[PDB]
Short mmCIF file of N, CA, C and O in Angstrom, two decimals:
data_model
loop_
_atom_site.label_atom_id
_atom_site.label_comp_id
_atom_site.label_asym_id
_atom_site.label_seq_id
_atom_site.Cartn_x
_atom_site.Cartn_y
_atom_site.Cartn_z
N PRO A 1 53.14 148.08 102.24
CA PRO A 1 52.60 146.73 102.38
C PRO A 1 53.73 145.73 102.66
O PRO A 1 54.91 146.04 102.46
N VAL A 2 53.38 144.48 102.97
CA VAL A 2 54.36 143.43 103.26
C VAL A 2 55.38 143.22 102.14
O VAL A 2 56.50 142.81 102.42
N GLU A 3 55.00 143.44 100.88
CA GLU A 3 55.89 143.28 99.74
C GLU A 3 56.99 144.35 99.78
O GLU A 3 58.16 144.04 99.57
N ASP A 4 56.60 145.60 100.01
CA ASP A 4 57.53 146.73 100.09
C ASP A 4 58.46 146.49 101.29
O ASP A 4 59.64 146.84 101.25
N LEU A 5 57.93 145.84 102.34
CA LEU A 5 58.64 145.48 103.57
C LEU A 5 59.77 144.51 103.23
O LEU A 5 60.79 144.53 103.92
N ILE A 6 59.67 143.70 102.17
CA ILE A 6 60.73 142.76 101.78
C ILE A 6 62.00 143.54 101.41
O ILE A 6 63.11 143.11 101.72
N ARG A 7 61.84 144.71 100.78
CA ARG A 7 62.93 145.58 100.33
C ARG A 7 63.26 146.68 101.32
O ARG A 7 64.12 147.52 101.05
N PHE A 8 62.64 146.66 102.50
CA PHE A 8 62.86 147.64 103.54
C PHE A 8 63.46 146.97 104.76
O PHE A 8 64.47 147.45 105.26
N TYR A 9 62.95 145.81 105.18
CA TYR A 9 63.42 145.04 106.33
C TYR A 9 64.93 144.76 106.24
O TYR A 9 65.65 144.93 107.22
N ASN A 10 65.39 144.35 105.06
CA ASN A 10 66.78 144.03 104.80
C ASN A 10 67.68 145.23 105.10
O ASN A 10 68.64 145.09 105.85
N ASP A 11 67.31 146.41 104.61
CA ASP A 11 68.09 147.64 104.86
C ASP A 11 67.89 148.13 106.31
O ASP A 11 68.83 148.58 106.95
N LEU A 12 66.68 147.98 106.86
CA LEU A 12 66.26 148.37 108.20
C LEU A 12 67.13 147.74 109.29
O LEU A 12 67.24 148.31 110.38
N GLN A 13 67.83 146.64 109.01
CA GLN A 13 68.72 146.02 109.97
C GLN A 13 69.82 147.03 110.38
O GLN A 13 70.34 147.00 111.50
N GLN A 14 70.16 147.93 109.45
CA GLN A 14 71.14 148.98 109.62
C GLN A 14 70.51 150.08 110.49
O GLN A 14 71.19 150.59 111.37
N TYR A 15 69.23 150.43 110.30
CA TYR A 15 68.56 151.46 111.11
C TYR A 15 68.64 151.06 112.59
O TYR A 15 69.08 151.86 113.42
N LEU A 16 68.30 149.81 112.92
CA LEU A 16 68.35 149.36 114.32
C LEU A 16 69.79 149.42 114.86
O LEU A 16 70.00 149.60 116.06
N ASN A 17 70.79 149.25 113.98
CA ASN A 17 72.20 149.32 114.36
C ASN A 17 72.48 150.77 114.77
O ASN A 17 73.11 150.96 115.81
N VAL A 18 71.96 151.78 114.06
CA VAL A 18 72.17 153.20 114.41
C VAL A 18 71.50 153.50 115.76
O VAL A 18 72.15 154.07 116.64
N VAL A 19 70.24 153.08 115.94
CA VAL A 19 69.46 153.30 117.16
C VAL A 19 70.25 152.83 118.38
O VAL A 19 70.42 153.58 119.35
N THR A 20 70.75 151.60 118.34
CA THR A 20 71.51 151.01 119.42
C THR A 20 73.00 151.34 119.36
O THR A 20 73.76 150.88 120.20
N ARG A 21 73.43 152.13 118.37
CA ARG A 21 74.81 152.51 118.10
C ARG A 21 75.67 151.23 118.10
O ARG A 21 76.82 151.25 118.53
N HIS A 22 75.09 150.12 117.63
CA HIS A 22 75.65 148.78 117.55
C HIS A 22 76.14 148.37 118.95
O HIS A 22 77.33 148.16 119.19
N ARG A 23 75.20 148.26 119.90
CA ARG A 23 75.42 147.89 121.31
C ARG A 23 74.37 146.86 121.76
O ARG A 23 73.88 146.95 122.89
N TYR A 24 73.97 145.93 120.89
CA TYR A 24 72.97 144.91 121.20
C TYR A 24 73.32 144.09 122.44
O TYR A 24 72.43 143.63 123.15
N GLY B 1 46.40 140.42 99.59
CA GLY B 1 47.11 139.56 100.54
C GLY B 1 46.51 138.16 100.58
O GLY B 1 45.94 137.74 99.57
N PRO B 2 46.75 137.40 101.66
CA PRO B 2 46.26 136.04 101.84
C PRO B 2 44.78 136.05 102.25
O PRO B 2 44.15 137.11 102.29
N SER B 3 44.19 134.89 102.54
CA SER B 3 42.79 134.82 102.96
C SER B 3 42.69 135.43 104.37
O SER B 3 41.69 136.06 104.68
N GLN B 4 43.70 135.20 105.21
CA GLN B 4 43.74 135.73 106.57
C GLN B 4 43.73 137.27 106.56
O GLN B 4 44.16 137.87 105.57
N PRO B 5 43.32 137.91 107.67
CA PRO B 5 43.27 139.36 107.79
C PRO B 5 44.68 139.95 107.95
O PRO B 5 45.71 139.27 107.76
N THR B 6 44.73 141.24 108.24
CA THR B 6 45.94 142.01 108.47
C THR B 6 46.73 141.45 109.67
O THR B 6 46.26 140.56 110.39
N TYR B 7 47.96 141.93 109.86
CA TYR B 7 48.88 141.52 110.93
C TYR B 7 49.48 142.76 111.59
O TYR B 7 49.52 143.81 110.93
N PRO B 8 50.13 142.61 112.76
CA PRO B 8 50.77 143.72 113.48
C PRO B 8 52.01 144.27 112.76
O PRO B 8 52.56 145.29 113.19
N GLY B 9 52.45 143.61 111.68
CA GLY B 9 53.59 144.00 110.88
C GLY B 9 54.87 143.90 111.69
O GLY B 9 55.16 142.84 112.26
N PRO C 1 58.55 150.01 122.46
CA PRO C 1 59.66 150.94 122.34
C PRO C 1 60.81 150.28 121.57
O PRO C 1 60.85 149.06 121.42
N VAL C 2 61.82 151.07 121.18
CA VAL C 2 62.98 150.57 120.45
C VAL C 2 63.68 149.41 121.18
O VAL C 2 64.18 148.51 120.52
N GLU C 3 63.69 149.41 122.51
CA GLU C 3 64.32 148.38 123.32
C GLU C 3 63.67 147.02 123.06
O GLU C 3 64.38 146.04 122.83
N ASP C 4 62.34 146.96 123.09
CA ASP C 4 61.59 145.73 122.85
C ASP C 4 61.74 145.37 121.38
O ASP C 4 61.88 144.19 121.05
N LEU C 5 61.75 146.39 120.50
CA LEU C 5 61.90 146.20 119.07
C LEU C 5 63.20 145.45 118.78
O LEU C 5 63.19 144.63 117.88
N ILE C 6 64.29 145.66 119.53
CA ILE C 6 65.56 144.94 119.30
C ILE C 6 65.30 143.43 119.36
O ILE C 6 65.79 142.67 118.51
N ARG C 7 64.64 142.97 120.43
CA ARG C 7 64.32 141.57 120.65
C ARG C 7 63.40 141.07 119.55
O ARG C 7 63.76 140.13 118.83
N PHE C 8 62.25 141.72 119.43
CA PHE C 8 61.20 141.43 118.47
C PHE C 8 61.74 141.34 117.04
O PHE C 8 61.48 140.35 116.38
N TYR C 9 62.49 142.34 116.58
CA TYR C 9 63.08 142.44 115.24
C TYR C 9 63.82 141.17 114.84
O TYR C 9 63.61 140.64 113.74
N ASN C 10 64.70 140.69 115.72
CA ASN C 10 65.49 139.51 115.43
C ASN C 10 64.61 138.28 115.28
O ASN C 10 64.89 137.44 114.43
N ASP C 11 63.55 138.15 116.09
CA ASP C 11 62.62 137.02 116.03
C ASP C 11 61.63 137.20 114.86
O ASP C 11 61.19 136.21 114.26
N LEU C 12 61.37 138.44 114.45
CA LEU C 12 60.49 138.86 113.36
C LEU C 12 61.00 138.33 112.02
O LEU C 12 60.21 138.22 111.07
N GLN C 13 62.26 137.88 111.96
CA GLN C 13 62.84 137.31 110.75
C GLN C 13 61.92 136.18 110.26
O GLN C 13 61.64 136.06 109.07
N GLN C 14 61.34 135.41 111.20
CA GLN C 14 60.45 134.30 110.93
C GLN C 14 59.13 134.77 110.34
O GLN C 14 58.63 134.10 109.44
N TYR C 15 58.52 135.85 110.85
CA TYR C 15 57.25 136.39 110.37
C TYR C 15 57.34 136.73 108.89
O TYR C 15 56.50 136.26 108.11
N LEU C 16 58.35 137.51 108.49
CA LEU C 16 58.53 137.88 107.08
C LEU C 16 58.69 136.60 106.24
O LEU C 16 58.09 136.46 105.17
N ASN C 17 59.37 135.61 106.82
CA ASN C 17 59.60 134.31 106.21
C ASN C 17 58.25 133.63 106.00
O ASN C 17 58.04 133.06 104.94
N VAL C 18 57.29 133.69 106.94
CA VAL C 18 55.97 133.06 106.78
C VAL C 18 55.18 133.76 105.68
O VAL C 18 54.67 133.10 104.77
N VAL C 19 55.06 135.09 105.75
CA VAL C 19 54.32 135.92 104.81
C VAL C 19 54.66 135.61 103.35
O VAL C 19 53.74 135.52 102.53
N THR C 20 55.92 135.31 103.05
CA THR C 20 56.39 135.02 101.70
C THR C 20 56.91 133.58 101.56
O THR C 20 57.42 133.22 100.50
N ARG C 21 56.72 132.72 102.56
CA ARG C 21 57.19 131.33 102.61
C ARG C 21 58.67 131.24 102.23
O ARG C 21 59.08 130.35 101.49
N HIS C 22 59.47 132.21 102.69
CA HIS C 22 60.91 132.35 102.46
C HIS C 22 61.26 132.58 100.98
O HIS C 22 62.43 132.56 100.60
N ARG C 23 60.28 132.87 100.11
CA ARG C 23 60.48 133.11 98.67
C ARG C 23 60.95 134.54 98.41
O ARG C 23 60.38 135.23 97.56
N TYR C 24 61.93 135.02 99.17
CA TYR C 24 62.46 136.36 99.03
C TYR C 24 63.05 136.55 97.63
O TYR C 24 62.90 137.60 97.02
N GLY D 1 63.39 159.26 124.24
CA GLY D 1 64.77 158.81 124.22
C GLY D 1 65.71 159.96 123.88
O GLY D 1 65.82 160.88 124.70
N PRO D 2 66.36 159.95 122.71
CA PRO D 2 67.30 160.99 122.28
C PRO D 2 66.66 162.37 122.05
O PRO D 2 65.48 162.59 122.30
N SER D 3 67.49 163.33 121.62
CA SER D 3 67.07 164.69 121.33
C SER D 3 66.16 164.67 120.09
O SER D 3 65.19 165.42 120.03
N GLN D 4 66.42 163.76 119.14
CA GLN D 4 65.63 163.66 117.92
C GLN D 4 64.18 163.23 118.22
O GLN D 4 63.96 162.42 119.13
N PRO D 5 63.20 163.71 117.43
CA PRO D 5 61.80 163.35 117.60
C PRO D 5 61.55 161.92 117.10
O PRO D 5 62.49 161.21 116.71
N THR D 6 60.29 161.49 117.11
CA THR D 6 59.86 160.17 116.67
C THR D 6 60.34 159.87 115.24
O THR D 6 60.47 160.76 114.40
N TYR D 7 60.74 158.62 115.02
CA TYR D 7 61.18 158.09 113.74
C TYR D 7 59.96 157.36 113.16
O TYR D 7 59.14 156.90 113.94
N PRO D 8 59.90 157.07 111.85
CA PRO D 8 58.75 156.38 111.26
C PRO D 8 58.54 154.95 111.79
O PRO D 8 57.45 154.39 111.61
N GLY D 9 59.49 154.40 112.54
CA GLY D 9 59.38 153.05 113.06
C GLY D 9 59.53 152.07 111.90
O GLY D 9 59.88 152.49 110.79
#
């Protein structure tokens, strides 16, 4: 749910960094 | 949740 | 796709902010 | 995309 997303979105910023291998 | 329905997340 | 998600994700900061009125 | 399968998104 959106509440669990509060504690996932913050860490998820790192997941997107892996996906793009930090090449935004 | 709120009064409004679900969202695309 | 992940490509669009890069753009969306950064702007999505506002959505999470609305859902909780920035009361993180 | 990569060799890895779908991620949970």
